[PDB]
Amino acid sequence: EFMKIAIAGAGAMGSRFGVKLQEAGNQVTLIDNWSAHVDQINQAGLTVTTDDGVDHVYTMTAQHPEAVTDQFDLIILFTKTMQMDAMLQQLAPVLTNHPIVLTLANGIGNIETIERHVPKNQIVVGTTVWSSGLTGPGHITVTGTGSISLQAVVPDQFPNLADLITTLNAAGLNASAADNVLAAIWKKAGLNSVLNTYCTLFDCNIGEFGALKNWQTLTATVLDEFQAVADAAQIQFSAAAVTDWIAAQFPAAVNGNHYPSMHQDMANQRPTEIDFLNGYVAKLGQQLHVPTPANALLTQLIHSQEQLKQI
Amino acid sequence: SEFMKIAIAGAGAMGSRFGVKLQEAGNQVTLIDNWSAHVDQINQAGLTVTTDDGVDHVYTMTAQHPEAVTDQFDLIILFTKTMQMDAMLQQLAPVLTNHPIVLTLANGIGNIETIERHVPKNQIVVGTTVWSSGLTGPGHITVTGTGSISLQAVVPDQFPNLADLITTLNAAGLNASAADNVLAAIWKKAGLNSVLNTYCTLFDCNIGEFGALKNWQTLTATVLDEFQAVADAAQIQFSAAAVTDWIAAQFPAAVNGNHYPSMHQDMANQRPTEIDFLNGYVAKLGQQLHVPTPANALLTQLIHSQEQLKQI
Numbered sequence A: 001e002f003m004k005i006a007i008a009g010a011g012a013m014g015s016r017f018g019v020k021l022q023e024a025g026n027q028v029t030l031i032d033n034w035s036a037h038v039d040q041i042n043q044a045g046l047t048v049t050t051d052d053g054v055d056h057v058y059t060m061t062a063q064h065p066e067a068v069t070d071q072f073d074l075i076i077l078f079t080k081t082m083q084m085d086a087m088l089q090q091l092a093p094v095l096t097n098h099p100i101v102l103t104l105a106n107g108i109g110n111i112e113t114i115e116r117h118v119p120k121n122q123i124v125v126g127t128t129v130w131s132s133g134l135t136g137p138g139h140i141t142v143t144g145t146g147s148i149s150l151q152a153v154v155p156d157q158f159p160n161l162a163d164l165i166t167t168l169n170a171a172g173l174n175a176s177a178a179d180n181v182l183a184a185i186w187k188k189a190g191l192n193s194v195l196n197t198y199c200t201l202f203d204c205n206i207g208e209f210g211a212l213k214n215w216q217t218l219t220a221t222v223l224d225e226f227q228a229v230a231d232a233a234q235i236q237f238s239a240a241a242v243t244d245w246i247a248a249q250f251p252a253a254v255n256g257n258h259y260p261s262m263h264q265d266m267a268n269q270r271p272t273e274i275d276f277l278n279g280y281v282a283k284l285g286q287q288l289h290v291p292t293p294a295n296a297l298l299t300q301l302i303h304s305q306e307q308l309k310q311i
Numbered sequence B: 001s002e003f004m005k006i007a008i009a010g011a012g013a014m015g016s017r018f019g020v021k022l023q024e025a026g027n028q029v030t031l032i033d034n035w036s037a038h039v040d041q042i043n044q045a046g047l048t049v050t051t052d053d054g055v056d057h058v059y060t061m062t063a064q065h066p067e068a069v070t071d072q073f074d075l076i077i078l079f080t081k082t083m084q085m086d087a088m089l090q091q092l093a094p095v096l097t098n099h100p101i102v103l104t105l106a107n108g109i110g111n112i113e114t115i116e117r118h119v120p121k122n123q124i125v126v127g128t129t130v131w132s133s134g135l136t137g138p139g140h141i142t143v144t145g146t147g148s149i150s151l152q153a154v155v156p157d158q159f160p161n162l163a164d165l166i167t168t169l170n171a172a173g174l175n176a177s178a179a180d181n182v183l184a185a186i187w188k189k190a191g192l193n194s195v196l197n198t199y200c201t202l203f204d205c206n207i208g209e210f211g212a213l214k215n216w217q218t219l220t221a222t223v224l225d226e227f228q229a230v231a232d233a234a235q236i237q238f239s240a241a242a243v244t245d246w247i248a249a250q251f252p253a254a255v256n257g258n259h260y261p262s263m264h265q266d267m268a269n270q271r272p273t274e275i276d277f278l279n280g281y282v283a284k285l286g287q288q289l290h291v292p293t294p295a296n297a298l299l300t301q302l303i304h305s306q307e308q309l310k311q312i
Helices: A012-023 A035-044 A084-090 A092-097 A110-115 A161-170 A181-202 A206-210 A215-233 A239-248 A261-267 A278-287 A293-309 B013-024 B036-045 B085-091 B093-098 B111-116 B162-171 B182-203 B207-211 B216-234 B240-249 B262-268 B279-288 B294-310
Strands: A004-008 A027-031 A046-049 A055-058 A061-063 A074-077 A100-103 A123-128 A133-136 A139-141 A148-152 A175-177 B005-009 B028-032 B047-050 B056-059 B062-064 B075-078 B101-104 B124-129 B134-137 B140-142 B149-153 B176-178
Touching: A004 A012, A012 A027, A012 A046, A012 A055, A012 A133, A012 A139, A035 A061, A084 A092, A084 A110, A100 A110, A110 A123, A123 A181, A148 A161, A148 A181, A161 A175, A181 A206, A181 A215, A181 A239, A181 A261, A181 A278, A181 A293, A181 B294, A215 A239, A215 A278, A215 A293, A215 B294, A261 A293, A278 A293, A293 B182, A293 B216, A293 B294, B005 B013, B013 B028, B013 B047, B013 B056, B013 B134, B013 B140, B036 B047, B036 B062, B085 B093, B085 B111, B101 B111, B111 B124, B124 B182, B149 B162, B149 B182, B162 B176, B182 B207, B182 B216, B182 B240, B182 B262, B182 B279, B182 B294, B216 B240, B216 B279, B216 B294, B262 B294, B279 B294
Parallel strands: A004 A027, A004 A074, A027 A061, A046 A139, A074 A100, A100 A123, A148 A175, B005 B028, B005 B075, B028 B062, B047 B140, B075 B101, B101 B124, B149 B176
Antiparallel strands: A046 A055, A123 A148, A133 A139, B047 B056, B124 B149, B134 B140
């Protein structure tokens, strides 16, 4: 089983998937907005450095999304939450043959974003534990092995699941169907909606958050609302499990001295992902008649902080 | 007998001015204060009062630290700040056994509840005043203009002689009247403070910067709609809309655009804030009256975390 495949968002992860899929016999296009990266791949090849320190160079097709004139059987989306709508907009002409759209992007309002651009029954969500590092333009460094877990958004109308799994497995990507993928993405969004958001508001690192005398109340306030919205959305969720995971980050040997991504975003005057974290639970809670006053307020506070940071 | 034995508890600018006037009117006055330089200066060289014409007037006054006080009184007038008030009353415990009138003119809004833990609530009277006074230094105030006081008994059907208290204040030229809009006025101010202080502190911004926010109205409503709901349950007059217009009036540079409110300066100096007597007080009272206050409760927690971080 082969497909014609587009990797939309060709960072570390996308580039690694692309090489493996091409080497397996699939036709692959890497789609990305970073010019240096797209140019380097086309001009000097994509460098893949393995554990033994050997540099492997692959001939790959890379394009900016507006330049893409081909159409595909499958789009694999790695583009971040906030860039995803623009990317799909630029690919409008590409989408008219109604491809499978597999989102492996981190974060949690990705389905809803994708729904504005393609019929929801062609959407599949996924997680993966494959890893990859972006060393520079046209250069990744890779190690270890991995797997992918997949869940159709509309299982009773998605015809292509078997084909999708066969194609990914034939490339050695180790994919399987599972019903708890959306739950896993929610669980991660729970952790992110406590640690990113509070660290940003307080200008502190993860250990300093965990040293707060009211860290448990702050965490519960957010997560009890997550739990209520997940319940109404019929997505498995455990506030208690997310809490244990958060607390596991506190020690210096894990993430005690790390500032999370939203904190760095704020520090660099970049717009944060708040509307895909606390803001998404608030918006979805609104739609399901579940009160989310804490998450709604935290979202507003972050928006105000962003506005002040660009004075 | 216009002649009362009076203690001024909290003898900053305002208390010192009240005290001098009440002493000069024929009352026996004790100034009670925690600032040693001030207490020493008053006892050693008198209280200096500088008037508009620049003339320095010096009065002989009695000042003590609360711990030292053994006298008893007919009236305590409280100016002590929300957060210091419990400690002050604690230190005066032996003094309070003759059940004095307690008149609180302190700014802020959980003062009655604090006082209730030390004296029966029916001896409590709340007040506002527009007398002004400036604290120039230890034992030295500068004063201007005239003023008035509005007074409201906390338990009007059990407070016997409000008229006597007014007679004593007025014989000293303080221009007091009975009114029943005082508690509402305190709530109104607590409303303004719970928006401007708290958000400016969280955002490290000034009042104009807050007003320039594209979501200033939502942030203000979130707090004030809860205030309105708790005031309603407490049967205290409150208007979110009027408080909102007052807040908005502060934004221009010509008013308070470039000022940082008191809580912001407190945070900047690693001082504990008055959050538990602002957003924290509405949250606690809302809890007691079964009114949800999730926004004010969270804002309170955020400010507590910020205080903790500021002392690393």
